[PDB]
Design a protein around this ligand. Structure first.
Ligand SMILES: [Mg+2]
Length: 537
């Protein structure tokens, strides 16, 4: 039943816990949104490849979503609306697969490959992006030529063909920007084609495209990215990196302590994050810093929370934990949980099972329009207006989709924008602000970081490594990987096509090899001397 297969494929995007290891261990580490958990320190922090972690995106999307999409596409030629929606989500997941690994099966990933009886070649990144524009144009026009109801839709589009059209056009704008370095003229042409389309694009948050997940306890119904970020036990929360912390603090970003909180979480629930026992001591922690003329030490990329050891405050320092330590010291005076309380952690609001699965937002389109303007493309309105719109929408998406309290006021948004105008390097400003936007969309975060080379990351090569703590540094090139390696079993079961793709790369499956649309290395910060804690060597 094709509509059901649309549902499974949509939900798998963020709903499949079995590929979230790749996002917590590698991608969100590579983007330097998160740092300090043992896993991201072991993998992304050590620049340490391991097949079983790197393969999961490939293996799980091909085994489930792509299989179901292709079968449903072939079973839906009489249901043009559903057919177009199936095909748009295939383009979507193929763009993620290609942006992650490089050349990938696509044009030959068909019914035979589904049945496990045929071996698909790896389409080149350049050929795939060419096909993205063509296929999205075709689907966009096909939408609404059927009378069938897209009942398997679980996105915010809610089966509305007009909303799927704007989604397809917005993805065209995303891909057109992606190729704007390697093929400037095609990027310009494809962008303005979509931007000027009669059916429009995602112009306000009312038209945001996202998958809707269920508010049920921790089969793709719940957002598994939040699940793995919440950790599978209270000793493994997701710690916010110093890169993100310092981007927020140093720009006066009201998002600083919406994204960052301090938790003592020993009795927290494991079926659904609870305010009761994810004890939010943020204000009391900050009051403690201020009393002692000290401050935050957000974990550096490459380091774990127990490295670059920060002094641990006694329970007495925090009145809420103090009175609970005095009631029950085994629970609330545990020194390990006090230690992790010291570091900024991701708000559990971002870790709820019902968190959305972002596909593309009006805030991103705003930033695309801003950069399109700074490139001279024929866009209406100045770069600053689009830029400001995108900052305001990124702000507002947290109010609308995530925050359960402490919403960001219109005063704060207006204040922040005034202090962070475009400046002398708009491309850097635009893409740094998009990178915050993309926190919970790690694949777009990593792709757009790679293409735009902003934000300037912390130079991993000048941050500490901790081999004495069991981590393995088996790669001399410690700069951020620009892709993931192919699943190693492809070398056996798709051996000839695997060899070919590797040969096109230069003869080895090299995760320091830049993809076709990635023309330069991501920028890095020249200096990192934080007021508290450790910086560059
Ligand atoms: Mg690059």
């Amino acid at each position: 039943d094709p509509n059901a297969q649309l549902t499974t494929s949509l939900l798998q995007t963020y709903g499949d816990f079995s590929l979230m290891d790749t996002y917590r261990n590698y991608i969100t580490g590579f983007t330097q949104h998160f740092a300090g958990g043992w896993n991201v320190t072991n993998y992304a922090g050590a620049v340490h490849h391991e097949d079983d972690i790197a393969r999961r995106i490939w293996d799980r999307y091909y085994e489930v979503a792509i299989k179901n999409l292709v079968d449903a596409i072939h079973k839906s030629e009489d249901k043009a609306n559903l057919n177009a929606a199936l095909r748009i989500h295939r383009v979507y997941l193929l763009s993620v697969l290609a942006d992650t690994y490089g050349d990938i099966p696509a044009s030959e990933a068909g019914l035979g490959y589904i049945s496990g009886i045929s071996n698909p070649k790896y389409d080149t990144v350049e050929d795939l992006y060419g096909w993205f524009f063509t296929e999205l144009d075709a689907c966009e026009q096909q939408l609404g030529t059927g009378t069938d109801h897209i009942s398997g839709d679980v996105t915010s589009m809610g089966g509305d063909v007009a909303k799927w059209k704007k989604y397809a056009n917005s993805l065209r704008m995303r891909y057109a920007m992606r190729i704007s370095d390697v093929n400037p003229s095609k990027g310009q042409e494809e962008f303005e084609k979509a931007m000027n389309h009669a059916d429009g694009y995602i112009a306000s948050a009312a038209d945001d495209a996202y998958i809707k997940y269920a508010d049920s306890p921790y089969d793709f119904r719940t957002n598994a990215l939040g699940e793995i970020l919440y950790g599978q036990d209270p000793s493994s929360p997701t710690f916010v990196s110093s890169t993100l912390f310092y981007q927020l603090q140093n720009t006066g970003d009201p998002r600083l302590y919406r994204i960052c909180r301090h938790y003592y979480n020993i009795k927290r629930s494991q079926v659904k994050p609870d305010k009761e026992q994810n004890i939010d001591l943020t204000d009391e922690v900050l009051a403690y810093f201020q009393r002692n003329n000290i401050g935050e030490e957000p974990c550096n990329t490459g380091s774990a929370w127990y490295e670059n050891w920060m002094n641990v405050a006694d329970a007495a320092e925090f009145p809420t934990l103090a009175k609970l330590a005095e009631q029950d010291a085994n629970s609330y005076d545990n020194s390990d949980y006090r230690a992790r309380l010291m570091r900024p952690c991701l708000n559990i609001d971002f870790e709820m099972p019902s968190c959305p699965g972002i596909l593309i937002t009006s805030a991103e389109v705003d930033f695309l329009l801003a950069e399109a303007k700074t490139k001279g493309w024929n866009v209406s309105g100045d770069a600053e207006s689009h830029y400001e719109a995108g900052v305001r929408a990124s702000m507002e998406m947290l109010n609308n989709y995530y925050l359960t309290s402490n919403k960001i006021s219109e005063d704060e948004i207006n204040a922040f924008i005034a202090n962070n105008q475009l400046g002398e390097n708009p491309k850097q400003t635009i893409n740094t602000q998009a990178w915050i936007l993309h926190m919970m969309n790690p694949s777009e975060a990593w792709a757009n970081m790679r293409r735009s080379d902003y934000p300037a990351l912390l130079d991993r090569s000048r941050l500490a490594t901790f081999p004495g703590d069991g981590f393995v540094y088996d790669d001399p090139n410690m700069s951020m990987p620009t892709r993931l390696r192919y699943p190693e079993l492809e070398g056996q079961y798709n051996s000839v096509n695997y060899k070919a793709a590797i040969e096109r790369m230069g003869g080895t499956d090299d995760w320091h090899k830049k993809l076709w649309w990635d023309k330069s290395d991501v920028n890095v910060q020249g200096d990192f001397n934080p007021p508290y804690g450790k910086g560059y060597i």
